[PDB]
Write a protein that binds this ligand. Structure first.
Ligand code: IYK
Ligand code: MG
Ligand code: ZN
Length: 313
């Protein structure tokens, strides 16, 4: 009850900033997450023993892949923490509870392969879940862990609060399917500019939480340049392995996944900042003005990729 987590001074200050990097010490990531729940939600939100058992079972169900790993889970939860802390009064008690957990769980048991690769492979998960294949699996793995003995962190909620939080988590996790982001953002763009955006309309909140989820999930583009640039190596290590696996099925992969086309990465990052990241953080900033540092950091990183193309690095 009286047991705070406390971080060293540099981490205590920097964890509050959007561009915080959780560092290379894996054993500190659980404590960093509990710290964020305790400040975001409260020391009362979860029984510490249950929360600790939940976190360690979640960790165990992330795989040793280059990018879609336990570090990504905690990184995406920290971005959500910074959004929630900068928008104190906009979110319900249940939302603060659900969203940090949703972010920690959002890529559970990822294999380092896209929905496309599973469908082309004819993976069993592609027959069980015809759209948002991996994201339905990530939600399925979250419910599994919540149902293990001693892992039910929501046990003090009523039946209908419990149903609501699990529905916040399902929609949050489904929204991390980038195929769904383009339409979600166009609708938010229209709603904001015709003035119809209403945060009391549940279906509107759902859309805004979905964009928050895209923003947290892509947050590697919002770090200081050396973090962004080194994370890009991990992202492409997966893409290129998928490309190899497409070539094994007798399919020329897209260039983004073809390691023979490494030279075109700087131009591919440009397209992604312009087509995905910038539009994402721009619409997020219009809806939630205090998230503007994410858009500013993304813009700085776009400018760094422009310098790479110009051979200035
Ligand atoms: C779109 N695109 C095309 C290329 C390309 C590269 C080499 C050769 C030919 C084409 N690279 C990208 C970059 O793509 C992404 N970067 C991400 C960065 C961070 C977090 C999620 C991301 N998700 C995606 Cl999909
Ligand atoms: Mg994912
Ligand atoms: Zn993710």
């Amino acid at each position: 009850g009286l047991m705070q987590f406390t971080l060293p001074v540099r981490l205590c200050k920097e964890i509050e900033l959007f561009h915080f990097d959780i560092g290379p010490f894996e054993n500190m990531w659980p404590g960093i997450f509990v710290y964020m729940v305790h400040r975001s939600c409260g020391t009362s939100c979860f029984e510490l023993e249950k929360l600790c058992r939940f976190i360690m079972s979640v960790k165990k169900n992330y795989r040793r892949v280059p990018y879609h790993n336990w570090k990504h889970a905690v990184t995406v939860a920290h971005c959500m923490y910074a959004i929630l802390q900068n928008n104190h009064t906009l979110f319900t008690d249940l939302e603060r509870k659900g969203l940090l957990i949703a972010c920690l769980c959002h890529d559970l048991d990822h294999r380092g392969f896209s929905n496309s690769y599973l469908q082309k492979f004819d993976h069993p998960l592609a027959a069980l879940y015809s759209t948002s294949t991996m994201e339905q699996h990530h939600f399925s793995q979250t419910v599994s862990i919540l149902q293990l003995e001693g892992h039910n962190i929501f046990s003090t909620l009523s039946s209908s609060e419990y149903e609501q939080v699990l529905e916040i988590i399902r929609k949050a996790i489904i929204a991390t399917d980038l195929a769904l982001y383009f339409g979600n953002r166009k609708q938010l763009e229209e709603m904001y500019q015709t003035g119809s955006l209403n945060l009391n309309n549940q279906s509107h909140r759902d859309r805004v939480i979905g964009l928050m989820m895209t923003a947290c999930d892509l947050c590697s583009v919002t770090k200081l340049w050396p973090v962004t640039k080194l994370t890009a190596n991990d992202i492409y290590a997966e893409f290129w392995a998928e490309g190899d696996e497409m070539k094994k099925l007798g399919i020329q992969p897209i260039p983004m996944m073809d390691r023979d086309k490494k030279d075109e990465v700087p131009q591919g990052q440009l397209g992604f900042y312009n087509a995905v990241a910038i539009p994402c953080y721009t619409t997020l900033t219009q809806i939630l003005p205090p998230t503007e540092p994410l858009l500013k950091a993304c813009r700085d990183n776009l400018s760094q990729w422009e310098k790479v193309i110009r051979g200035e690095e």
